[PDB]
Design a binder for this molecule. Structure first.
Ligand SMILES: CCOC(=O)c1c(C)n[nH]c1C
Ligand SMILES: [Mg+2]
Ligand SMILES: [Zn+2]
Length: 326
């Protein structure tokens, strides 16, 4: 049908920053994670490399996607698809050419796909403050992130869902460890420490004559993968403005809903969650200045000059949001 043809055409931009992910979500019947993951797995020849049966991949992807909440405005299957595709583009950076193995590539992409699964639309701090069952289970540390991992891995056990069935025991152990290390690193409470270590690597950077990064041990390799997926997670402000604005509307909706729950419970309303006392534009400029730009400028230095266009877009968007403040 016409819908299928237009979807296929939009998916031709899968290797580009600024993919029309919302349009893909609409055209696919709200299956952006399934179609984008499938497209990327075919593009990178991952099904053949890891002997993943196509039916198994689609079954797992659809099940995983079903565990993202359709009533959560930001932390849903569209965000997951976006982080997956963003990681996919970052992995193709010329400075990282042939740096990571196929298993490491698989781990980064899989981690991106499951990284927010079953997100309830409220923060770790909210879960801790409300004495939730999740915070009790996880002892207040990386509560959501531990849960996303547990669900992502548990779903592999469903009927015809083990996409890693033909990996060796060693490969399965290695992939699991890498995925856990990556998703736990998406917890924002770990941002400052991750950035500090990324800055240290940039200062002690070792490269070939062409500018390709030389990473030998696991500690350095996983650190780059952790920061890569963290950058992908925090990539909305670096995308074309039309996309960024849509992501902002979505996170503000989610935040305001959390603030409504806090207000009625007599709790202090979390930053950016009070719909009656919000400054959306000022908050975006602040988030770029204090979190997103420091991170992306450091990533840009690591892969210089491959991320210049991304950094340029970030700065363009910061300038535009600032202009909306009288
Ligand atoms: C698109 C704008 O996103 C944010 O402001 C934001 C913050 C702050 N925390 N998480 C997100 C996604
Ligand atoms: Mg998360
Ligand atoms: Zn996320």
């Amino acid at each position: 049908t016409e819908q299928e043809d237009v979807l296929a055409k939009e998916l031709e931009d899968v290797n580009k920053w600024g993919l029309h992910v919302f349009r893909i979500a609409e055209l696919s019947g709200n299956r952006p994670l399934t179609v984008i993951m499938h497209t990327i797995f075919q593009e990178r020849d991952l099904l053949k490399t890891f002997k993943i049966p196509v039916d198994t991949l689609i079954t797992y992807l659809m099940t995983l996607e079903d565990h993202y909440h359709a009533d959560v405005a930001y932390h849903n299957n569209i965000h997951a698809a976006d982080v997956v595709q963003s990681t996919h583009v970052l992995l193709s950076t010329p400075a990282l050419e042939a740096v990571f193995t196929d298993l490491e590539i698989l781990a980064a992409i899989f981690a991106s796909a499951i990284h927010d699964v079953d997100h309830p639309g409220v923060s770790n701090q909210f879960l801790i403050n409300t004495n939730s069952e999740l915070a009790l289970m996880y002892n207040d540390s990386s509560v959501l992130e531990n849960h996303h991992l547990a669900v992502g891995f548990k779903l592999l056990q469903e009927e015809n869902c083990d996409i890693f069935q033909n990996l060796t025991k060693k490969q399965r152990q290695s992939l699991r460890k890498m995925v856990i290390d990556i998703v736990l690193a998406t917890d924002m409470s770990k941002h400052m420490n991750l950035l500090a270590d990324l800055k240290t690597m940039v200062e002690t950077k070792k490269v070939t004559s062409s500018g390709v990064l030389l990473l030998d041990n696991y500690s350095d390799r996983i650190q780059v993968l952790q920061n890569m997926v963290h950058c992908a997670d925090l990539s909305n402000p670096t995308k074309p403005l039309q996309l960024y604005r849509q992501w902002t509307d979505r996170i503000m909706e989610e935040f305001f809903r959390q603030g409504d729950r806090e207000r009625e419970r007599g709790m202090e309303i979390s930053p950016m969650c009070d719909k009656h006392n919000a400054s959306v534009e000022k908050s975006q400029v602040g988030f770029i200045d204090y979190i997103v730009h420091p991170l992306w400028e450091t990533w840009a230095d690591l892969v210089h000059p491959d991320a210049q266009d991304i950094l340029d877009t970030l700065e363009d968007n910061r300038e535009w949001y600032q202009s909306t403040i009288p």
